[PDB]
């Protein structure tokens, strides 16, 4: 029961599969603690911490990227994980969960939803 989105920046792109599972988070076939501009790191933890890390218990996020500079990818996958997550809750859980995640993200930033 999958859904997919993609996120964009300057000259890079990222595609994110969401389907339900044991709760892991992957980038290019790697767990997310090893994404290495190393100071922008928490910048990609931001769709986890703005929501609360219980939502990521039952889902699974495969992510792979192409191109762009070494900032572009990070901005790309934070956008892509946000739109994928709100997509999943929209299609298989209640509408109001979709509302809380949407307004919850939108108050923090705007880049997460519009490229």
């Amino acid at each position: 029961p999958s859904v997919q989105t993609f996120g964009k920046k300057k000259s890079a792109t990222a595609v994110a599969h969401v389907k339900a599972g044991k709760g892991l988070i992957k980038v290019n076939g790697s767990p997310i603690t090893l994404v290495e501009p190393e100071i922008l790191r928490f910048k990609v933890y931001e769709p986890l911490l703005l929501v609360g890390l219980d939502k990521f218990s039952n889902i699974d996020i495969r992510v792979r990227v192409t191109g762009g500079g070494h900032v572009s990818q990070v901005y790309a996958i934070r956008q892509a994980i946000a739109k994928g997550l709100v997509a999943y809750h929209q299609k298989y859980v209640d509408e109001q969960s979709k509302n809380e995640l949407k307004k919850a993200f939108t108050s923090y930033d705007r880049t997460l939803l519009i490229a």
């Binding site: 044991k22 709760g23 988070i25 997310i32 603690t33 100071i39 928490f42 933890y45 911490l49 890390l53």
Partner: protein
């Protein structure tokens, strides 16, 4: 837990408060009315690397975290243009150095230096009638902030040139000296002189 770990110092500090690199935004107040609304410390952030656009409208630049504003101003003289990652590193370090040298929120320390730096009355180049005479204008809170940041970074950068120090350091020096006021700071010295000049044109 989830399939791909994610550390303790991550899980915690993160979802609880939304601290800085790891410093708290709550409890830093802009010790100077006026200047609030312009020193942005109220919407917290993990890194001074906002990818926003503060150029399209006239005052949007105020909604920019003063930390990241400080860190942008770091990145200059041609050779350092665009090198934010460097700046972000410098900033991170500085904050640490500042905290080692006074506990405190170094971000409170930063704010203060910006707080007690802005001039009150700047001088305009009135006509004069040839041998021009400057006239004692008051200055805007956005300029106060703008110029402050300017001063402290040009201070650190040019402040500690040919020496045995790092910008992180000389920025901590310039921010600490200014976040207290004790004539040891190139920005405080400059402000007090711009101002002494203003009382002269009155």
């Amino acid at each position: 837990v989830l399939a791909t770990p994610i550390p303790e110092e991550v899980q915690q500090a993160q979802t609880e408060i939304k601290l800085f690199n790891k410093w708290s935004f709550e409890e830093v107040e802009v010790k100077d009315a006026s200047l609030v609304d312009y020193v942005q410390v109220r919407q917290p952030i993990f890194v001074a690397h906002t990818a926003g656009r503060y150029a399209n409208k006239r005052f949007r630049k105020a909604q920019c975290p003063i930390i990241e504003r400080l860190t942008n101003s770091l990145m200059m003289n041609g050779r350092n243009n665009g090198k934010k990652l460097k700046a972000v590193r410098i900033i991170k370090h500085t904050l640490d150095i500042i905290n080692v040298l006074t506990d405190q929120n170094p971000i409170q320390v930063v704010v203060d230096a910006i707080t007690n730096t802005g001039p009150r009355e700047d001088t305009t180049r009135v006509g004069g009638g040839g041998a021009a005479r400057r006239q004692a204008v008051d200055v805007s809170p956005l300029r106060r902030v703008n110029q402050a940041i300017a001063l402290l970074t040009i201070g650190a950068r040019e402040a500690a040139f040919r020496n045995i120090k790092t910008i992180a350091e000389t920025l901590a020096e310039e921010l600490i000296n200014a976040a207290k006021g004790s004539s040891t700071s190139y920005a405080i010295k400059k402000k007090d002189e711009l101002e002494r000049v203003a009382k002269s044109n009155r």
